[PDB]
Amino acid sequence: KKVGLLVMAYGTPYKDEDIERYYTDIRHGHKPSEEMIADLRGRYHAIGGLSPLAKITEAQAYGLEKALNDSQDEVEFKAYIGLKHIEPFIEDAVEAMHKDGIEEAISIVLAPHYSSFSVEAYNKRAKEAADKLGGPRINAINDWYKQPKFIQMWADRINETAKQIPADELLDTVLIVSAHSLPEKIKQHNDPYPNQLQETADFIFEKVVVPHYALGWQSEGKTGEPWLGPDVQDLTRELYGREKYKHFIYTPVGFVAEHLEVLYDNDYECKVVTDEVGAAYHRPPMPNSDPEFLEVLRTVVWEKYSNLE
Numbered sequence: 001k002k003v004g005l006l007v008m009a010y011g012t013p014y015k016d017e018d019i020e021r022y023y024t025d026i027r028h029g030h031k032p033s034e035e036m037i038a039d040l041r042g043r044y045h046a047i048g049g050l051s052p053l054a055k056i057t058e059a060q061a062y063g064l065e066k067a068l069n070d071s072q073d074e075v076e077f078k079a080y081i082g083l084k085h086i087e088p089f090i091e092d093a094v095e096a097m098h099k100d101g102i103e104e105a106i107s108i109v110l111a112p113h114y115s116s117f118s119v120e121a122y123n124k125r126a127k128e129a130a131d132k133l134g135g136p137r138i139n140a141i142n143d144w145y146k147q148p149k150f151i152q153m154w155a156d157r158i159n160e161t162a163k164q165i166p167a168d169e170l171l172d173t174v175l176i177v178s179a180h181s182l183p184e185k186i187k188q189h190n191d192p193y194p195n196q197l198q199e200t201a202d203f204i205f206e207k208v209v210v211p212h213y214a215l216g217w218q219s220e221g222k223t224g225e226p227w228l229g230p231d232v233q234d235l236t237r238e239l240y241g242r243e244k245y246k247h248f249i250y251t252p253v254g255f256v257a258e259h260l261e262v263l264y265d266n267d268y269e270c271k272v273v274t275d276e277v278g279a280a281y282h283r284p285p286m287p288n289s290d291p292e293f294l295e296v297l298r299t300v301v302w303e304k305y306s307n308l309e
């Protein structure tokens with residue numbers, strides 16, 4: 001008997017024509033205006049037309065399945081992809097697990113940090129789906145940024161970039177560690193997300209040769225409420241004003257793949273600012289399906305499985 005591996009991620013439009021219904025899902029079912037739709041479509045156009053997130057997410061889910069199954073023979077894992085905002089939805093994945101006779105599953109979100117807005121919603125939807133179906137039992141992983149191989153992965157990528165910076169400009173180099181912003185109100189109830197990002201930045205910092213670092217947030221939404229900051233664009237300007245850094249290295253460690261909110265919100269919007277101030281822009285490769293990242297996820301899931309049994 002197999003163990004279901006429910007791999008959850010945000011989702012991305014497969015076709016240009018999917019953007020409207022995808023955006024409507026993000027907006028809790030309320031259809032955005034033509035102006036809002038045009039702006040989002042323009043951002044997808046600016047990164048090449050569509051996001052590669054769908055193919056990367058598949059490569060991560062099935063690469064994880066293979067890493068687990070090749071490394072042991074206590075159990076057979078079978079991966080099921082469940083997405084937040086487009087088919088196959090979380091609910092579709094849980095239904096396929098049930099139809100296939102899966103009775104026990106482990107779930108993981110392709111985002112290493114926990115928050116009430118992100119991972120908690122994934123877990124709630126998966127559990128409510130399985131409850132209405134009668135199975136499988138879903139054993140949820142909430143976060144995994146503490147995994148040492150995850151920290152070392154990011155540190156290695158940062159050090160490889162730092163080694164190509166002129167030795168006498170390393171003192172003028174800063175590491176910007178970021179993740180997707182959320183409404184500032186989550187701080188009012190001690191949601192762990194801001195502290196988990198600070199811990200990740202601290203863990204990475206002690207393993208890199210870059211002498212300066214700062215925590216920032218990116219991709220805040222179109223609401224009328226305050227969001228966690230500073231925003232990476234605003235922080236870049238402020239740090240240049242204060243310290244005149246020559247190199248900015250962006251690691252949006254809240255994310256695990258190259259998608260719209262790295263290819264646009266870092267590689268376009270942050271580079272606009274470094275260009276304005278006369279500094280150099282650096283953004284190390286995202287984890288994607290690199291074997292080192294697949295080994296991070298394998299360690300996480302296998303530790304979870306070993307602790308259930």
Ligand code: FEC
Nearest residue numbers: 010011012013027051053111118180220221222259260261
């Ligand atoms: C948190 C979080 C993550 C990371 C965890 C995860 O991966 O699930 C996260 C991850 C992603 C990822 C990738 C993408 C890129 C998809 C792609 O097609 O490449 C991605 C894309 C978008 N998100 Fe996203 N998100 N996200 C929010 C929170 C999170 N989001 C909140 C909150 C809102 C605000 C919703 C609202 O308007 O009411 C929100 C809105 C958007 C919009 C709408 C336009 C915009 O705001 O710029 C787009 C597009």
